[PDB]
Enzyme design. Structure first.
Site: not given
Lengths: 308, 307, 305, 307
Positions: A152, A279, A249
Site C-alpha cells: 500500500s 486492499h 481495491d
C-alpha cells in the site's frame, strides 16, 4: 469475480474524518495485532536497530531467518496511508517472508504524517535501504544489493526508493515487489478508485484516502512530485518488478498501469491480480487463502528474482 | 495492454481442414524451440510405463534431488486433448521440479481423435493413482501428492481430483490448474469471445471448435462433469491454485471455477496474470510473466500455500 | 458504481408459492404504473387464437391512422410473473414516443404452462398481428418485436422462428436486457451480480424461475429456450440494451456480437449504474426514461437497419 | 469485440512532428468524405457571426422546420481542441436538427495552438449565452436550450454548463456529452492506456499528447476545472446524457463524470456503446452504432429524457 465468501463475512463488521490521528493509530495497531497473534510466526533472530537518517534516528526491525553471512536482503516498508502502522502491524508478514525467502528482512519504521509531511517518509525509506546496502557486514547480508518491498503506502515507498536510487545513479536496488501500491497520490480518479472505495469495502474508503492525503501533503502541488506519484516518473533503468493487485481495491487500476508503464520503458515487470479480495489482504493471510498464496509468491519471487 | 514483447511475438495460419498429424508435428517443433532455449537441468529423469485400464501409459519422472519421501506433482501437458507430449512441456516440468523440490511425473495420456473422451480422463486418473500406489518405487511421500496441468491438462488435473473424490480416495492433496478449460460446451463467456479472434493466434475460435470435434464422439458428451468439471459437485475437493491470463478465452471460466470451489467450502485462489495470453507459461524463457508463474506455482505446491 | 438513488431504492425493497409471488409482483409493478400515469389515445384488449388456445393481447394506439407502424411487445417476469398490466406504462410511453401501435402479448405463464407454451404464444401473436394488419390499422411491413428480460427472450426466439420459416414480417428486434442462455452455464456477470444485495434478480430467484419454466432442466438446451445457441443468420437488425449490474449483462452483449458475426446489423448499449429491470422504474430513475426514449426513437426510425 | 465492419474500416489506416496545418487539412478532407456520404438535408442553414469576448466567432445555424420558439442545441465539434470546424461535423448537426426538431447552432470556437486554453472555453460560453440572449433573432425558445458536443467539444459543452452555473445563469437546461475529454492532465485511467495503441488509429497516445501540447500554454493549466471539469464542483448542473465507447481511451473518465454528477444530485445517464471506438458517431453512414447514437441523442434532447 465475487468477493470470497469468508471475506464477505469478515467485512460485515462495523472511521470519520474528524477523529484524531492518535486514536486511529491505536485502533489500527490493536486490529493489526489480532492478525499477528493468530499467525504466531517463528523467527530465528530478530532485533531492532537505529539507522541514522536525514530527519533523525530511524528505527528498523531486522528479521534473520537462518545463520550465515552474505544472506539475501529485503528492505520492507509497512502500509498505513503514510499515517498509521509500524513494524509491529506487519511483523507476521515480515517473519513469514524471511522464513520462506531465506532472506534477512529489514522493516523500516519510517516517519509518519501529519507530524512528518512528504517527503519525510521517502527520505527515511531511501536512507534506510542505502544504509542496509552500505552496512552489510553489520547485518551479515549481501554486499550492496537488496530487494525493496512494501504494501500500500509502503509499496509507494518501495517504488520511489527504487526511483531515487536510479536518479542518484546508485545500483543497490536489484528487485522491487509492490504489494497493491498507491502510485498516484493526486486526486485524479480511476474506475477502481471510485468503484471500490464505498463504505461497504471498509479498509480503504474514499473518506479515508482523502484524509490520508491531507495528512501526507504540506501543499497540493507536492502530489505531482515523482517521489509522491511515481507513475509520473521517468521509469527507465528501474529494477525488475513484481506488482500484486487485489480485484476489489481502489488502487487496482493504477497498480496495473504502473507495471505496464514499467514495461514500456523496457523494465521487466509482472502484474498479477488476486481475485476475490480487497486492499490489504496480505495481512489477513492467517484467515484468507489468498494472503498465504501471496506471501508464498512474493517470497519465492524475491528468492529467485523470478521476474529478472 | 498486451506486454510489448508479446505484441512482437504475436505478429504471425491454422486451418480447420488440417490433418491431425501435421498440426501435431508443427506443435512439437514450435514447443521444442522453447524447451531448447530454457536449457533446464535435472538431477535424475526416467521414462516409465504405467499400466492403465486402456493400456500402457508413458510417463516421465523428474527427480530434482535425492531423498525418499519427496513430495510429488502429477503433471498433465496441454495441447487441446489432441496435441503435445511429455517432450513439449519438458522445460516446465524440470523447472517446476527444481524450484519445488518435488518429483514431477508428467503423463502422456492418450490423444484424440484416436482416443476420444473419456480415454485421457481415465489415463489421467490411472497415472495419478499409480503414482500414489507406487510411492516407494518413486521415493515420494504418498501424503504429499499434487496434480497440475496447463489448459487441457488443467482440465485433466481438475477432473482427476474429482475422480479420486468420487471413489472416496484422498491421495490428491493439492491441485494447480494453469489456465484450465473447465467448460467444454459451446456456452460462451465474455472472455471466450473477446480473446479468440485470429490476432491472438494461440487459442482461436477455429482452433477451439476443432479440438472439440476431435475430443468428443458426440458434442453432447461435453455435458459430462468429467468433460466440463465446472458442472461437477465441487465439495470435498483439494485446495486449488488457479492461474489465469488476461487475454485468454478461458480466463472467465477458470476464475469462475476458483470461485465455485469456494462456495462449496474448498479453499481456492485465482490469480490473473496481466498482459499475457493463453499458454504463456511455456514461453517463460522470453516472458517474465512465465518465469514468475513457474516460481509461483512451484512455491505454492512446495508449501501447499492455499491449504 | 450503482446510481445513488438506486441504492436508496434497493435499501427500501428488503424492508413462497407462485400465486403470492405473482400478486406481489403485480402490486409493486402497479405502483410504478400509477406514478407514470401515462395517457393513450386508444387502448383495447383482443383475443388472438393461438395453438394453445386464446391469447389475450392489449393494443395501444397512440394516434389516428391506417398503416401505422407496429410493435409486438412481450413483458418480463421470469416466465412466471407479470402481465400486460405490469408493463402498461412502458407500452403506453413507447407508443406515444414511437408513434407505433403497440400490441403487448399476455403469453401463457409457467409453471401452469411449461416451456415452450409461451414461445408458441409469442410467435402465434406476432404472426396474427402481421396477418391481421387491416383490423389493427397497422402496416404489415413495419412490424417490430420487443420485450424485457424473459420477454426479451421471447422476442429473440419469435424472430428466430419466423426466420426458420422464411417469413419476413419481423423487421426489427429490440431486446431489453434479454435472457438468451437459460442453461446453468456460467458467465462472470451471472455470478457477480446475483447476490442478495441486488434484490431484483438473485441466483435463488433465477433458479426458482428455471424450475417453474422448464418441465425438466435439460429443456434449457433447446435453442427455443436459449437463443444464444441458435443459428443467427438472416435475423432482423437488433438493438440490445444491457444493464451494468445485471446477471444477464454478459450474455446480452454476447448475443449482439454474435448477430454481427453472422452479418446482422446489431447495436449493444449498456446502461451504467443500474440493475436488471431498470426500465420499469423510469418514473423515479433517469436511466429508465432515457432507455424508453432511445427504444421508441430507434423503433420509429429503425436506426440500426 | 470490435464490430467486424469497424475492424475493416480501421484496417484502411499521424506523426507527433507534423505541423498543425497538414493535420488540419487531412482531418477536414477525411471528415468531409463522411459528410458527403451522409448527404443530409436541412430546411434552412446559414452562417452567422457571434461577437465573443475574444473576437468574432463563426456559428452555423441549422433550422429543421418553421416556427418561432423552437428548442435549441448549442453544438461544439470535436478535434482535440486543435482540428475541425462546423464543416467537419455538418452532417451530424443536420441529422441531429431533423431528428430532434431543434435549431442547432454549431460553434466554430478558436483553435489551439494559435489560441491556447482558455480561448475555446470562453468562446463556447459566449456563443451559448449569445444564443440565449438573441433567441428572438434565431426563433428559438430561450427556456429550451441544450449544450452538446463530441470529444473536445464534449469538454466544451460540459465546461459551458459549469461557467453558466458559476455566474448564476440558468439558460443551459440539458447537456449531452458525446465521449468527452473531462480530464486533460497526464493522469492515466485503464481505458486511456488500453485503447491508445496504434491499432486503434482514431485517438492514439501520441495524438493525445500532441493535442495537450497545442492546447496548453503551460502543462499546469490542465489542473484548471475549466480544462478538466472532472475536478470541478458539479452541484447544480443541468441533467446530463453521457455517451461512451467501449474501445475508447476516454471511456473511463466519461463514465466517471456521469457518476460524479449523480453524487452531487444532478440527474445523469451514462450509456456505453459496445464494439466501437472514439469518434464513432461521425461514422454513422457506415456504422449502425453511429446511427443509433444520433437517434438516441436527438430523442433525448427533444424530450429532455434524463431531466
Amino acid at each position: 469475480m465475487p468477493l470470497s465468501p469468508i471475506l464477505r463475512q469478515i467485512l460485515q463488521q462495523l472511521f470519520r474524518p474528524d477523529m484524531d490521528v492518535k486514536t486511529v493509530r491505536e485502533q489500527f495497531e490493536k486490529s493489526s495485532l489480532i492478525l499477528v497473534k493468530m499467525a504466531n510466526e517463528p523467527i530465528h533472530r530478530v532485533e531492532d536497530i537505529t539507522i541514522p537518517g536525514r530527519g533523525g534516528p530511524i528505527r528498523a526491525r531486522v528479521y534473520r531467518p537462518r545463520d550465515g553471512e552474505r544472506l539475501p536482503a529485503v528492505v520492507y516498508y509497512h502500509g498505513g496511508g503514510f499515517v498509521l502502522g509500524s513494524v509491529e502491524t506487519h511483523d507476521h508478514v515480515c517473519r513469514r517472508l524471511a522464513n520462506l525467502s531465506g532472506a534477512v528482512v529489514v522493516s523500516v519504521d519510517y516517519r509518519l504524517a501529519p507530524e512528518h509531511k512528504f517527503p519525510a517518509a521517502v527520505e527515511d525509506a531511501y536512507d534506510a535501504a542505502k544504509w542496509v546496502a552500505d552496512n552489510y557486514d553489520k547485518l551479515g547480508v549481501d554486499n550492496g544489493k537488496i530487494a525493496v518491498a512494501g504494501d500500500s503506502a509502503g509499496g509507494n515507498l518501495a517504488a520511489v526508493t527504487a526511483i531515487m536510487a536510479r536518479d542518484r545513479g546508485e545500483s543497490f536496488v536489484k528487485y522491487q515487489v509492490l504489494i497493491y501500491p498507491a502510485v498516484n497520490l493526486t486526486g485524479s480518479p480511476t474506475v477502481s478508485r471510485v468503484e471500490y472505495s464505498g463504505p461497504e469495502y471498509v479498509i480503504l474508503t474514499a473518506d479515508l484516502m482523502a484524509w490520508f492525503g491531507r495528512q501526507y501533503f504540506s501543499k497540493p502541488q507536492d502530489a505531482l512530485s515523482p517521489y509522491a506519484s511515481p507513475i509520473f516518473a521517468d521509469l527507465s533503468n528501474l529494477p525488475p518488478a513484481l506488482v500484486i493487485t487485489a480485484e476489489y481495491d481502489p488502487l487496482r487500476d493504477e497498480g496495473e498501469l504502473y507495471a505496464h508503464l514499467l514495461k514500456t520503458r523496457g523494465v521487466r515487470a509482472v502484474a498479477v491480480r488476486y481475485n476475490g479480495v480487497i486492499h490489504g489482504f496480505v495481512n489477513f493471510y492467517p484467515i484468507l487463502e489468498e494472503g498465504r498464496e501471496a506471501v508464498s509468491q512474493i517470497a519465492a519471487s524475491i528468492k529467485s528474482m523470478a521476474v529478472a
